[PDB]
Amino acid sequence: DQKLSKLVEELTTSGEPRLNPEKMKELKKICKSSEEQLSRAYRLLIAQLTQEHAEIRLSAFQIVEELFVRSHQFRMLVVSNFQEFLELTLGTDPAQPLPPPREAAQRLRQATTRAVEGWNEKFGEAYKKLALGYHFLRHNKKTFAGKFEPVQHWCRAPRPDGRLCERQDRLKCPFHGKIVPRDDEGRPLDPEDRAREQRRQLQKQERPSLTNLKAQADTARARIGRKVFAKAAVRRVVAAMNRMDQKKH
Amino acid sequence: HTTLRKVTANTAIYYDPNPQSTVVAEDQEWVNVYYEMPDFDVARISPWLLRVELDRKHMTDRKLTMEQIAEKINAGFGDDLNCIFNDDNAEKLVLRIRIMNMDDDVFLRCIESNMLTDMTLQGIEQISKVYMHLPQT
Amino acid sequence: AIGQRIVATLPYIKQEVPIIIVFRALGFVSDRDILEHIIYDFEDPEMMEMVKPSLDEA
Amino acid sequence: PGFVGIRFCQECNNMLYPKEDKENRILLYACRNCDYQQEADNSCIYVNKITHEVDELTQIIADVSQDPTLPRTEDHPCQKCGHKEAVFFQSHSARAEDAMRLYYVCTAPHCGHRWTE
Amino acid sequence: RLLLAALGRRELDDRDHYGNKRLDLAGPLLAFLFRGMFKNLLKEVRIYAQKFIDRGKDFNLE
Ligand SMILES: [Zn+2]
Ligand SMILES: [Zn+2]
Numbered sequence: 157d158q159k160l161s162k163l164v165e166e167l168t169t170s171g172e173p174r175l176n177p178e179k180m181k182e183l184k185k186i187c188k189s190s191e192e193q194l195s196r197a198y199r200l201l202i203a204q205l206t207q208e209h210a211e212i213r214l215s216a217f218q219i220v221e222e223l224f225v226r227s228h229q230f231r232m233l234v235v236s237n238f239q240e241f242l243e244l245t246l247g248t249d250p251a252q253p254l255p256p257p258r259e260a261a262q263r264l265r266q267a268t269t270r271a272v273e274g275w276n277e278k279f280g281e282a283y284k285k286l287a288l289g290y291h292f293l294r295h296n297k298k299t300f301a302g303k304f305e306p307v308q309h310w311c312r313a314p315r316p317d318g319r320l321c322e323r324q325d326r327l328k329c330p331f332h333g334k335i336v337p338r339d340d341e342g343r344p345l346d347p348e349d350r351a352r353e354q355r356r357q358l359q360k361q362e363r364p365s366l367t368n369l370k371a372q373a374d375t376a377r378a379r380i381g382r383k384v385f386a387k388a389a390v391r392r393v394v395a396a397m398n399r400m401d402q403k404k405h
Numbered sequence: 406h407t408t409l410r411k412v413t414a415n416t417a418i419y420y421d422p423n424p425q426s427t428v429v430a431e432d433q434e435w436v437n438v439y440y441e442m443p444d445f446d447v448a449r450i451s452p453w454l455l456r457v458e459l460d461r462k463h464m465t466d467r468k469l470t471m472e473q474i475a476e477k478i479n480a481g482f483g484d485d486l487n488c489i490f491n492d493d494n495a496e497k498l499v500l501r502i503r504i505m506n507m508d509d510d511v512f513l514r515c516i517e518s519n520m521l522t523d524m525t526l527q528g529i530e531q532i533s534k535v536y537m538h539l540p541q542t
Numbered sequence: 543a544i545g546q547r548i549v550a551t552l553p554y555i556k557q558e559v560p561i562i563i564v565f566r567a568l569g570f571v572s573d574r575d576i577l578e579h580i581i582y583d584f585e586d587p588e589m590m591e592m593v594k595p596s597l598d599e600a
Numbered sequence: 601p602g603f604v605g606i607r608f609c610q611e612c613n614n615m616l617y618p619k620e621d622k623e624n625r626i627l628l629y630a631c632r633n634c635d636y637q638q639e640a641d642n643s644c645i646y647v648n649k650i651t652h653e654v655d656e657l658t659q660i661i662a663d664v665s666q667d668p669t670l671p672r673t674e675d676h677p678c679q680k681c682g683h684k685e686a687v688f689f690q691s692h693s694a695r696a697e698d699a700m701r702l703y704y705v706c707t708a709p710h711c712g713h714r715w716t717e
Numbered sequence: 718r719l720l721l722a723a724l725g726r727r728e729l730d731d732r733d734h735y736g737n738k739r740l741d742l743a744g745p746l747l748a749f750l751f752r753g754m755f756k757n758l759l760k761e762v763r764i765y766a767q768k769f770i771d772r773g774k775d776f777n778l779e
């Protein structure tokens with residue numbers, strides 16, 4: 157009973173378009189041996205489905221699809237609670253929506269339907285609730301101004317290409333930090349500056365599976381959007397524009 | 406208070422998928438010089454470019470430099486939004502803004518609006534103008 | 543976006559309605575035709591940018 | 601830099617919106633109503649001129665010389681045709697309230713020359 | 718017009734200007750007042766005629 161529990165978790169958290177066969181093989185070998193255990197596995201499946209993370213739901217539906225066709229007992233239990241499976245898989249419940257990922261939710265629904273036609277074609281007549289369900293989906297839901305620009309000093313930093321830095325920056329070079337005077341060989345004239353740079357060089361030498369909702373936001377493009385689209389920022393956008401409106405008027 | 410819209414003379418958004426051969430001809434020298442040293446990767450560079458030119462008189466009046474402007478925008482937008490600036494000696498001071506790896510065009514439009522509205526380069530906020538004079542009383 | 547949007551108030555209409563919808567109701571559904579009715583000179587770009595958000599919204 | 605004007609679709613006569621084909625990265629203008637699309641040449645999507653550095657001569661019209669209200673002078677001859685008379689006024693518009701620069705319009709018919717000293 | 722006002726090509730209209738203003742003497746005032754009262758009279762007449770028709774008897778205009 158412990159082993160079957162571990163397999164169910166692994167398939168749901170595999171995070172792949174297709175579940176690993178070896179594990180599915182193991183589940184199957186466990187299911188037949190005992191009918192009671194097969195029922196327990198069925199039970200587990202629905203529970204996994206009723207949680208979250210449609211990708212895990214989509215992975216769960218792959219398990220459900222396999223155990224339907226090859227097991228009459230499982231084939232009965234799915235029919236016995238086909239209503240719940242209909243909301244969990246197709247997302248037909250008016251209240252509960254399909255959780256993220258959205259693309260995974262699309263795959264879960266699309267893959268779910270294609271089963272149903274085959275589900276109904278091969279087993280529609282025998283199982284009367286299934287026949288009603290397929291018909292239910294198909295038919296019901298379908299001035300100083302001091303200006304001076306003297307630029308004579310150069311960064312003269314030693315680049316990895318062997319050439320000195322020719323950037324003309326007043327105070328700080330972005331690629332090398334603070335700017336200090338250097339000779340023709342790019343060595344700081346102040347011995348203290350040479351020692352500090354050596355210390356900086358020494359410091360440099362010293363130096364489930366699916367993305368969660370927080371993890372999905374953890375990126376570049378989302379961070380800049382969060383800063384731009386902010387309640388305070390938009391108000392500051394309006395407040396700044398209001399002040400020029402006063403100047404315009 | 407000196408916001409960005411204040412110093413910016415004009416703002417323009419282009420499509421420049423090739424930084425090596427930029428759309429604007431009067432940038433090739435410094436843009437290629439900047440892109441020689443790979444401090445930032447070229448693969449992550451977004452193809453949409455926001456090219457903002459500043460006003461030199463506002464430069465001198467506010468004593469604002471290119472290094473300070475780049476530092477402020479970098480502190481505001483991380484390594485996500487990289488910006489490249491020319492030296493403070495050309496006849497036209499212009500710096501480019503690109504995102505780094507809704508359409509990117511509209512995203513860049515919103516970014517430009519946000520910068521121009523509430524990008525505090527210097528000065529205390531909620532202070533509009535400071536009048537400077539000798540008291541005769 | 544955050545562009546300026548042109549919107550109209552019609553009597554006996556409970557909710558405020560964009561002008562482009564009004565022009566489509568009057569029978570000018572082509573954006574070009576709406577532009578001819580709105581701006582008379584097409585070589586003036588500023589007006590065209592100013593009416594861009596209404597076309598985008600509708 | 602210059603300004604950018606809108607483009608119209610040749611099928612439904614609707615505006616072309618900016619769009620891009622990642623395969624070739626060639627500035628495309630694709631109409632979002634139908635499937636029509638076009639290849640741009642301006643390579644510019646949006647410009648915002650804060651300094652509004654534009655010429656008021658473009659907005660000045662040549663039919664204003666027939667106004668019996670504006671003043672006239674003979675000390676600023678028209679450069680295009682040499683006519684002595686000219687009608688002058690200020691910019692008298694927003695973002696041009698200052699700059700009292702006088703805008704002269706030639707009075708002689710069929711010339712309508714507008715200039716500024 | 719709204720656009721030209723927005724770009725500043727045209728000046729915002731002022732209410733104090735008498736070109737934008739009109740005067741309302743006895744003529745329009747009485748006409749407007751009468752118009753409301755004449756309609757009230759029409760309604761009264763319609764109410765009387767409707768009640769008489771419902772009762773089944775024709776109504777005298779006087
Ligand atoms: Zn350097
Ligand atoms: Zn079209």
Ligand SMILES: [Zn+2]
Nearest residue numbers: 678681706711
């Ligand atoms: Zn002339």
